[model samples]
Target: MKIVDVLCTPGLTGFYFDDQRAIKKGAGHDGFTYTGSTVTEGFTQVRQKGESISVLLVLEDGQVAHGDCAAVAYSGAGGRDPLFLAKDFIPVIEKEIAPKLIGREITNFKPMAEEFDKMTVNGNRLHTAIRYGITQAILDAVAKTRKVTMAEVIRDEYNPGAEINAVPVFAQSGDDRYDNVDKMIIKEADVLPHALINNVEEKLGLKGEKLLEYVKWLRDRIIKLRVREDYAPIFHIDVYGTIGAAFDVDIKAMADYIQTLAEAAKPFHLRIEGPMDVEDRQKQMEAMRDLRAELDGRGVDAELVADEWCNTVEDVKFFTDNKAGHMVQIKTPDLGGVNNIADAIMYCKANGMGAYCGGTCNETNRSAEVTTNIGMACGARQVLAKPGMGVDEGMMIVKNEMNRVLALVGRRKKL
Candidate 1:
């Protein structure tokens, strides 16, 4: 059957974290980083709690598919409102977006989505959130006809044999609410650069010969969080530009900092994300490369993950090809098409960089589940449980969806 119906509903939103105190504009000593940027500033105040849009695409075959046009929850990209589509882009969908897709074949996303992409709303390219939901609806509709989860349809070409399972999640435990048991927490140096730098001096009043005590001090704190010695969770930190900004490109300081973190991160491998940031994209890569190389010389086991300026597939490949970072976060929504995120994961796999399916904490259930499906299909290092940083509810939706999809895909194998 052909495409028969399309529905868009106003979706309820959820808080990125349970505690709204951290939502203030200024970067307080709030455990996580929140420098006064547009995106960060938007998150500083939780005005619209969980506001979003939901889409339903119905096929003539009576099968239905769901997609979410959730708001951005991640930092750095200027947290654009999800209400833009619900409040403003409705005309774009009704007059321009929905009209283009109504009578097409259920699986005909190619030329049609490209056709949708070509339309202009107020002289700008169509809003990405609208495109994202519309594309997901089409994909979900087609996957329904195929009788497979969305991930199965778009599994990465390189890692075709990858299994769908509970995606190894990297927690964004930047909020003070997260406890010691939480896995893979991130601390942004931009928010707390001094904490890492003066970890010994300010906190313990260590000085001079007592400075190396900082290494032991840091390690002892984290070592207590592990179950067994070998099973300590990986700790990832997003330094923003603070590390480079702190030292002003002083190579020795960067190297010493890496060495300090390496000693601190011990049996637990450290993924240092966005250690340095320069204005030029090329310069960002060059700077990361220099840092990665420094780690190589020092025989430091830490890996540098480049998130800044590596927004798209091409940007990710640029860092990978140039040996800039050991991993590149495929910040999913930045690529516009969610499938492009799966493609970028494959790209990172084809090259040497580790792939992370990154999304913001401020997402709705449908969008987060869809993203989890993509991670399971593409075989990523890990995925961010999105639309919120709070673990229980957000992780529940993504991980539980992954579990259900795993059962579905596994049962499919039996047949």
Candidate 2:
């Protein structure tokens, strides 16, 4: 395939919401919480804010691939500066990088990636966010030129689709907890719905026997909900990294709570998501291994899913190398772009690990479209289609385009 024109677009806005009480308690990380909250005496109130950014990427033929952050605004590290050191780095790509790629053949990407590495190393700009942007731009250009989706490009080059584990979704709020589970079951009636939930034991600063009682209370609420609903839909609980920090349940206590829930939902296909803390990649994998063993011995048939810990292709490799997790949750923005995310998914597939597409609390259709291609490419058993705020309204448009692509490859299975 021949490389065509590359176009870059700048300036897109996004919004973020935070329940500091929830986040600090849920995240349990000193790094994530602000001042006057639960664990570290951080802020109590949660806040929501809008942020803007310039997203730069290259378009190949008529398709888009590879994505990178051009500029970010209102971020804690970058502040409100219009252009930081990150912004200046793009010119090198525009001048030294784009010309070399204008007419190159698109079959092999390793050469391009190597050249990028060389340029970045020579220029001393390696490991910067900008480097990630440039790498994504090149990948986007290649995928577009070949008239293949990002997922297809990565899948063809690496391992093809392999059946792996699946991740479930959880309820955000309200009485619909059970209803939410039911909705998910109906949505994926034909496929097995991997259900997920979250519960915290006690307040962040709470102590003594009261804390234990609160933990039990929270555990009882979850169990009661599961029992009352008759477990019509099977699911897993996402402690949201808040077992003890937010709710004040100890690790051993959390494990005990999970066992209790497992026994309670034995008649149904219930599972527990992260029953342990995931501080980083290693901790995440360790938890997964322990969880797998625990569930296996109990005949509970549960699985551990890696979320915050899995942020890149290297991370995926690390998890698989350790047999750390049964399922991986991929966010389009986290992996940098659709192509990079697909690369990680392929890595998961090779190791017989399940992959799932997830949405950020705030994601638009632009991102969702990219994720949809990922779901199809990775051969994910089930995909999360959270069409919030019409942000994902364009998913229909991408879905139609994908249909056309599938037909061209003679892989169009159904409507």
Candidate 3:
């Protein structure tokens, strides 16, 4: 198969990019948007609209394969790629990327994705968002050319022995932690409610009282609202490092607090993400390592997850090697190419760590579906339901994609 043409179109992401630093430093919300000076570079406002580009590749057979170029909600912060505006990068794709991709032979996903993901412009590599979507389009094109699901392409090329089964989906609740969680309970999300505990004074509380209360409420709500007695959803809360801040970065204190949280959740399992962001990659790794030790030493049942400093494939390995946390979120967009996402997930599972195929709410449905395929192919511990904070939309996109892939693959197996 051969690539015929490349098309670019501007699109909107499911959520907006927020200045995490500004929000952490006490930025208040005005109605739906934030009210404060933007703290991150490349951000025009505290809450800026998220934009994406649809990278469409026309195959020789007149079939169109596509992917969406999107960045994280907190772009430019936590050592992620800069803000991705469709206007700024579509021309790059049109001139630099399209020429290389158009009229080229379509082959296996790994090498082609690596070639472009590692491609450089001026001195630096193409923005992570560009590399992210471009490789997705490549994967989609390869699958289309082979007449198979994207998961099959990844499974055959990357993990030969990989089991293409349905991965559990984790749903997030943006700011509506209370009402939104009810939706998750009704839906029976595999992992219920991210809870978005980013603020200390407001959400997490000064003494960690607020978050504990919320955890208890979440546990009770699930038990109360669940239609079946066998319904057990994991509690994975992303505090964005408020736990560390609340406890003054003391590993022992953090561990103690997390233990209380685990106890509060009772029979349900708890995984805490970004408990502390040390701000430096090395320091963050060490902090997580010690925090893990503290938690383990105390025999805490809760799982500590790495987020802030774990971005690239190499970072995933570094964190996994050092046992920084029990689980490392393979943040899809931050990993550049979807190929790297498979590599990251495989490496984490091989090295005794949980592999979470997670992306941002600030993505498109295309990106979400594509990553879900990769997650299913790699057998991730759980896949994040995304492209929006709303539980229903993200769940529908991710869950259906996983089921579709499963059905197609299962049918092929029968034949």
Candidate 4:
């Protein structure tokens, strides 16, 4: 199949952060600072919102594949406008991307992706959200043409050994902001604690040694949540570089901090993301390698996960090759395509690194479904439940896709 015409429209995609601590400005986001914190006058509100760009790719075969593009919950993550992305990307598609794609074979997708990568608006990259939705539509269109599910095409083109069933789903706690996740997940070993080194200090009312005092306290608290004596669910946290901030991003200092987390996380597992952000990628690469070695050397039972500034496949490749992170979060919106996410998963599995198919809660049903589908198809460690932090809705969207694809591929369970 080949692309013939591209159509796009606007749709409201409401997204919110796991943390409703109500940031006004100058708050830390992944690797950058954001002035547009959700609380604008932003009363004791609980959630923030954004819009999605609904896109349709019409193939020469007359099949229409659909996608929804929305910015992630944490704004400043590309800082894109739904209208701007839809408005600007159309011309790029019509003049540049569409023409290249018109005659191109759908199965051969890299050339088209490369072509889009090369087309920038006046020496700058185009909006990721728009480009992401377009790529999703194209891939989706191709899969429908083949009468195969998205997961199937991803396996055929990407990870040959990928299971045709669902990838594991990791729940981020929206209740952390409001209250608590269920009483059962504590026993399941599947939940990830949304705690960070920074917020634990400011929000959780811990300071200095006191902050570190309860590092293990929370983990033990969860450990007690399980009714099953055998429940050993993995405990994870997004530190957001709190270690680095606390210790001045000094690798040695952070290593000590990691030791504390490991001790607290003992008899269980801890996966930490954004241990520290120095606002420097090169330094981050060095720090990541060092931290991994440190953890492994001491058998700390904790793995460092990288997220900040590690946006694309190339960025991920850099970290993977250097052993920068035990797990690299392929934040889908950051990379801008379902195919890119597939590529990231394949890359990580190939490179002996763990891939977490992660994204913000700021997403749409279509986008989240597509994410879960691609993740299951390409073999990810887990797919994040998102677009909204509510576990029920997020789980519904992802699990629905998992079941849908599981049925489509004729495999109801993991192969």
The segments of candidate 3 whose C-alpha lies over 4 angstroms from its true place after superposition are: 19-28, 35-45, 76-80
Best by TM-score: 3
What is the C-alpha lDDT profile of model 3 across 1-415, one tens digit per residue? 9999999999999999889889889899789899978788777888988999999999999999999999988877766677787888999999999999988999789999999999987877898999989999999999999999999999998789767999988999988998989999898899978888999999999999999999999999999999999999999999999998898899998999999999999899999999998768999999999999988887899898898878789999999999998999998988788889999998988888999899989999999999999999988999999888778999999999999999999999999
Q: Which stretches of candidate 2 lie over 4 Å from their true place?
A: 1-5, 17-100, 109-140, 160-236, 244-256, 260-268, 278-284, 308-312, 337-340, 357-364, 381-415
Regions of model 1 farther than 4 Å from truth: 16-46, 73-85, 108-123, 156-166, 177-230
The count of residue-pair clashes in candidate 3 stands at: 0
lDDT of 2 by residue, 308-411 (tens): 56656787788777766577766554443345566666667777877765544344334444455556666763355433322223334344544654664455
Clashing pairs in 4: 132-336, 189-233, 189-234, 241-274, 241-275, 241-276, 361-387, 361-388, 363-387
Residue 72 CA error for candidate 1 (Å)? 1.9
In order, candidate lDDTs are 0.63, 0.47, 0.91, 0.68
lDDT for residue 163 in candidate 4, whole number 0-100: 62
- Compared with the true structure, the alpha-carbon lDDT of candidate 2 equals 0.47
Better of 2 and 4 by lDDT: 4
Q: Point out the higher-scoring one by TM-score: 2 or 4.
A: 4
- At residue 30, give the lDDT of candidate 1: 36
In candidate 3, list every pair of residues with a backbone clash: none
Worst 10 residues of 2 by lDDT: 72-81
TM per prediction: 0.79, 0.61, 0.94, 0.80
